[PDB]
């Protein structure tokens, strides 16, 4: 019956699902649980470089808030 | 962890792949080709065994000779056989291909395709039923399953 085609489709579906799921999870693993920063234009890259300096640990995804104000 | 064991299991793997993925080149010469087409048709669906219906001679693993082989045609059949990549097998389908059949005594007919190519399975009938041909294909699968290429290599 036609539903015996589904097992092969399910295998295809899992294979196509993995790259998208992996990229999202690896991005959050590598950027402190947040989305990887998007820098398409120099202004965005300029702020990312500034964050890397401001962090004090050389990672742009380490955010400093009002605790650094004084 | 003997070499006999590993060679034995590797034989089973390659034998399994080769028999589970048999791509035929059907040489539809005459009436028997019709029954071959009924083996691909829905009732028997040869494709469900892993036997693709229409495969090019460049990727084929088995040649099915389905019909009378005439003298004028014998050179072209041998040429296709010589161009088949290995491992290659030949199934002779029907009385004409098996031994000449109804036309055995003709001036223009090759008396069995096994004068031209080596034949692995002979399927009798005029024509063999689609089911008879399928039986013969499944017989070839079991013959491939019995192959011992790596065991023989290991004992050379």
């Amino acid at each position: 019956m036609w539903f015996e085609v589904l097992p092969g489709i399910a295998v295809m579906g899992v294979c196509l699902f993995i790259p998208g799921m992996a990229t999202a999870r690896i991005h959050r693993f590598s950027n402190g649980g947040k989305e990887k920063r998007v820098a398409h234009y120099p202004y965005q890259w300029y702020l990312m470089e500034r964050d890397r300096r401001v962090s004090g640990v050389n990672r742009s995804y380490v955010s400093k808030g009002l605790e650094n104000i004084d | 962890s003997r070499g006999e064991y590993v060679v034995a299991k590797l034989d089973d793997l390659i034998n399994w792949a080769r028999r589970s993925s048999l791509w035929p080149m059907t040489f539809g010469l005459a009436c028997c080709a019709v029954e071959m087409m009924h083996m691909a048709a829905p009732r028997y669906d040869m494709d469900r065994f892993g036997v693709v219906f229409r495969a090019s001679p460049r990727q084929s693993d088995v040649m099915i000779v389905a019909g009378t082989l005439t003298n004028k045609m014998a050179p072209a059949l041998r040429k296709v056989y010589d161009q088949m990549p290995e491992p290659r097998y030949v199934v002779s389908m029907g009385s004409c291909a098996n031994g000449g059949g109804y036309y055995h005594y003709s001036y223009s007919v090759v008396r069995g395709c096994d004068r031209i190519v080596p034949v692995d399975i002979y399927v009798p009938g005029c024509p063999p039923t689609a089911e008879a041909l399928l039986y013969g294909i499944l017989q070839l699968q079991k013959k491939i399953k019995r192959e011992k290429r790596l065991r023989i290599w290991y004992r050379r």
Partner: protein, 318 residues
Amino acid sequence: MFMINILMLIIPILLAVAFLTLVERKVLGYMQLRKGPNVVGPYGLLQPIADAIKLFIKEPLRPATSSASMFILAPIMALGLALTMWIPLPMPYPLINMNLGVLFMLAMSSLAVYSILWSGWASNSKYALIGALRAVAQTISYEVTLAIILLSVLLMSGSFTLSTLITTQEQMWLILPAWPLAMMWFISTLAETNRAPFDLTEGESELVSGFNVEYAAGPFALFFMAEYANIIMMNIFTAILFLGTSHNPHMPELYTINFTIKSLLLTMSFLWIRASYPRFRYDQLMHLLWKNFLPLTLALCMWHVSLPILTSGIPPQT
């Protein structure tokens, strides 16, 4: 970490291609009132594995190639480019976030025609080369509409960034404002990938289509994998382009599930179409492109340049 990401893209791609071969045979089987592979593994789930092993231990074909370097380069180019087409795709996040990702995909696909040309050159056969040239002429012809159609849709998106297509379709699928472009886009992808009813490389009108003809070729498996990776990729691109999935930043997996289903369904429609129609003649598919799609695509490009301006709906640049 990035090296893991690459392998978590490449390996699943090769597995999807493997099992698409099984899905095609079973879907085509049931539309033909039969089953397709159901003996090698339960529901034929081992059939792709048996075919793969069988092909790689098969003897290489004869005759010898005319050019060894081009004989080896063609399959490398086909498969290398096929995998490269996947790296900017947002699912919902891309492996490589390009500002000009759409243009990158156009550029890389236009290079896929070289494997056809090189394999024809290395075939050592006059007739096989002529077959390759007809295939190239088909491919480049339909590249014209894909580029112009793509440009027309981006006038509603506002940039060449693939992930911006997601934002553009946050309210509504682009297929509604652009269904005429979607129709011609979808057919162009069929003709671009040499799929039925445009599969003349596998047809009956070629000088080399004769069964008893021979020329240097192969490996068959590598070319086959490259082709089917492009079928899936084009249908993934089609979904993103016209059937944009909503993205929730806190639940990216929901995007991926919904996005995967749409891509699968579009891919199944390629199989659906292959089961339904006869094959075009070479001159007739040229006529379809040059005398039907192209005049209408140029007109719709004019319309989609004008429409955002006259409705005050120009999209943002960033």
